[PDB]
Paper text:
Recently, C=C bonds conjugated to C=N bonds have been shown to undergo full reduction to amines through the combination of ene-reductases (EREDs) and imine reductases (IREDs),6 as well as the newly discovered ene imine reductase (EneIREDs). The key step involves a stereoselective one-pot amine oxidase/ene imine reductase cascade to convert N-substituted tetrahydropyridines to stereo-defined 3- and 3,4-substituted piperidines. Depending on the EneIRED employed (Series A or B), the kinetic selective reduction of one enantiomer of chiral iminium 3f affords the enantioenriched piperidine 3c as the final product via reduction with a second molecule NADPH (Cycle 2; step vii). Predominantly, EneIREDs in Series A yielded (R)-piperidines whilst enzymes in Series B such as EneIRED-07 yielded the (S)-product.
In order to gain insight into the mode of substrate binding in the active site, we determined the structure of EneIRED-07 from [name] to a resolution of 2.55 Å in complex with NADP+ using X-ray crystallography. Crystals were obtained in the P21212 space group and featured six molecules in the asymmetric unit, representing three dimers. EneIRED-07 displays the canonical fold observed for IREDs,38,39 with two monomers associating to form two active sites between the N-terminal Rossmann domain of one subunit and the C-terminal helical bundle of its neighbor. Following building and refinement of the protein atoms, clear omit density was observed in each active site corresponding to the cofactor NADP+. The iminium intermediate (S)-3f, the preferred enantiomer for EneIRED-07 imine reduction, was modeled into the active site using Autodock Vina. The model suggests that the allyl group of (S)-3f is bound within a hydrophobic pocket formed by methionine residues M125, M183, and M214 at the rear of the active site as shown; the para-bromo-phenyl group projects toward the front of the active site bordered by L180, W184, and the NADP+ cofactor. This ligand conformation places the electrophilic carbon approximately 3.6 Å from the NADP+ pyridinium ring C4 atom, from which hydride is transferred. Modeling of the (R)-enantiomer of 3f places the allyl group at the base of the active site with less favorable interactions with hydrophilic residues Y225 and D238.
Residue numbers in the entry:
A (entry chain B): 7 to 297
B (entry chain A): 8 to 297
Amino acid sequence: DRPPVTVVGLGLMGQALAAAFLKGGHPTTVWNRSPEKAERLVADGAVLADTLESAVTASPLVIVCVSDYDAVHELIRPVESALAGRVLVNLTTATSTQARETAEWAAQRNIPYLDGAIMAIPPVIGTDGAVLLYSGHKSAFEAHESTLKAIAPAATTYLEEDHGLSSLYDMALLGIMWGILNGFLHGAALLGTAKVKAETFAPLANTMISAITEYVTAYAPQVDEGRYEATDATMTVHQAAMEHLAEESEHLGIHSELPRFFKTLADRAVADGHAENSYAAMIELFRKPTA
Amino acid sequence: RPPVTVVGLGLMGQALAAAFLKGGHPTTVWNRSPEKAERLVADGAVLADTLESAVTASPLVIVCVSDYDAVHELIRPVESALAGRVLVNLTTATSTQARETAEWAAQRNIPYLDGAIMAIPPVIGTDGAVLLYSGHKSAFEAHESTLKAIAPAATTYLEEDHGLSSLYDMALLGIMWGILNGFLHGAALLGTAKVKAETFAPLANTMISAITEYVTAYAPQVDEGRYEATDATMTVHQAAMEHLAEESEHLGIHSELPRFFKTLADRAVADGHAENSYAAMIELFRKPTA
Ligand SMILES: NC(=O)c1ccc[n+]([C@@H]2O[C@H](COP(=O)([O-])OP(=O)(O)OC[C@H]3O[C@@H](n4cnc5c(N)ncnc54)[C@H](OP(=O)(O)O)[C@@H]3O)[C@@H](O)[C@H]2O)c1
Ligand SMILES: NC(=O)c1ccc[n+]([C@@H]2O[C@H](COP(=O)([O-])OP(=O)(O)OC[C@H]3O[C@@H](n4cnc5c(N)ncnc54)[C@H](OP(=O)(O)O)[C@@H]3O)[C@@H](O)[C@H]2O)c1
């Protein structure tokens, strides 16, 4: 006998969340501003609620995954009555501020609130590859751990009592994803000028990525210690190599803004006295506010 | 175990030499600054009195200095002694730089391999080291076995084009900076909540590992020119990018990086990619900065 769960929001991610709960035996009530997106889910045994109220009331565990916290707040305020005493899990993407302003709203209405981040794509939801970071009501998490493991069986991980923490890790991890995707796509656009297929490039990209994890492990203690001994490569060397990517790009008639920018960053680090330091020393520039 | 010469004893130079030494090769080393050979000589390398005596000592000359301007200042005064020896240039280079050095070497009948070291010094000699060579097929085939001392698992020959090693290097370095910036800017973010980078890292690396899946899946999309959004649309990426931008501005940390990222999604969407996967960004990355 698997407990009931409600999923509010049936985007690409919403749909995957619901499906995961359904497959894991939970009686799954779904609702979306656009009901058409429940069609395939209802066929597989989900109940499409007539209203968000009837959706919220159906289950003691409400999962919401919509665009942003403006959409969350438009959705949860009209149903604050029916929410009260139910555990609301907000897996929508958010700033720390947004997560914490929603935490304070929920506490005032005695709604136990977990602020979550989905570190996975929809097809990964339900698999060992999915990592979900939750932070907020410790008791509420402890109570529903087993139900929530339907979307992240290997990595249903609770951080701290701070609701804003899930958001901070999410923001930091997404920045790494775009770092990689931009690096690989800009890299494929480079190799493209030599009629090299991205499918050919990829396995090498991924071998390099795997090896770059070593650098991350090794730069971490350097950031924490504030000591940046260059055992691998100096800012000078990084800086010079960055000139090559910038020039290579300009010259091949491809995108040059990304690498030019990267170079602007090394230039600054070196001007702040980091010439002989490892790439870990870039932490100091990344702490400094912009225009 | 054939003799090998390493010209350049920087952090990378020293590691290259050490690898050859440990692998039994009689290793002659030379550097503009001879002090950097000290530890290598103690382990059995011969410090040549001059670059000429260094080049002459072995039929295989490996050079790893700052840039191709430094290579050309070093190799031109010894073009005589080089002739008929295989010169392997593992210095970082543009495709143009690699190819202008290839044409200089051919005129002086010097067999020329242009290489890229896709590894850090401590990862030279291990299975983790990948080295990409491109140029003289015969010269590579002849010295494969000696060169496997620096990259035993991934001593990889590309094509006869000398500039190709440079293109793969440039593309792979772009990914390194992508990740390092992402992780360091990410640690600066988590830092505002007094979270240690050492704590963040294992999660960073779990996410990175999982992002490799996206790369293998976006590759065929870029090559086929079809960007079906099975994971997430440009719209969704675009919105999420707003969050990092705002979060950063607000926490008093660096905001240029994520703001820029967003500028890219905005453009992709304006070029009609709203409903396409992040693979569609290839089209923006092909377009010059104009
Ligand atoms: N791979 C991924 O896609 C991925 C990864 C992890 C995290 N996330 C996060 O998951 C969330 C949803 O992503 P997704 O793929 O489901 O996005 P999506 O496909 O764009 O879906 C957005 C969902 O939110 C609803 N919504 C949007 N604005 C609304 C409003 N003002 N009021 C009420 N409902 C509103 C939409 O309702 P309609 O159907 O009526 O438009 C839809 O159900 C985002 O915060 C995203 O950052 C996504
Ligand atoms: N180390 C890495 O992590 C790594 C990884 C892959 C590729 N690389 C490539 O390796 C090269 C340098 O690596 P590195 O880290 O060992 O560099 P480095 O520590 O900066 O050493 C640079 C080398 O170049 C020599 N040099 C510089 N200018 C010279 C000149 N005008 N005349 C003669 N020699 C000159 C230096 O000799 P002196 O000591 O006399 O100055 C030194 O041996 C770059 O092309 C870089 O892209 C580095």
